[PDB]
Amino acid sequence: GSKKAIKKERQKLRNSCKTWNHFSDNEAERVKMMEEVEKLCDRLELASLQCLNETLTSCTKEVGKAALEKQIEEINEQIRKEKEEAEAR
């Protein structure tokens, strides 16, 4: 039904993401990413969330940030696909 494992991973991924983002005051950029990460937590399986975490923990900060954003956007699209059906019924 619900697992806190995804929340733990989200807390790790989000925290790591901010620390390895750019340490800039541009929070708006991270806001969209955070909104998408929130969506990941809401419907994405933790297995996928873990995969993204591994990538950003397997790459440098810039690579991990770019890779994480690219992966998060792809996941967001997948969430949107689920949302579309969810909205349908």
Swiss-Prot record:
Widely expressed. It is found in: Nucleus; Cytoplasm, Cytosol. Disulfide bonds: none annotated. Induction: Expression is repressed by CEBPA. Strongly overexpressed in leukemic cells. Phosphorylated in M (mitotic) phase. Constitutes a myeloid leukemia-associated antigen and might be a target for leukemia T-cell therapy. The ZRF1-UBD region specifically recognizes and binds H2AK119ub. The ZRF1-UBD region is also involved in protein-protein interactions with other proteins, suggesting that it may be masked by some regulator, thereby preventing its association with H2AK119ub. Component of ribosome-associated complex (RAC), a heterodimer composed of Hsp70/DnaK-type chaperone HSPA14 and Hsp40/DnaJ-type chaperone DNAJC2. Interacts (via ZRF1-UBD region) with ID1. Acts both as a chaperone in the cytosol and as a chromatin regulator in the nucleus. When cytosolic, acts as a molecular chaperone: component of the ribosome-associated complex (RAC), a complex involved in folding or maintaining nascent polypeptides in a folding-competent state. In the RAC complex, stimulates the ATPase activity of the ribosome-associated pool of Hsp70-type chaperones HSPA14 that bind to the nascent polypeptide chain. This is DnaJ homolog subfamily C member 2. The chain holds residues 346 to 432 of 621 of the full protein.
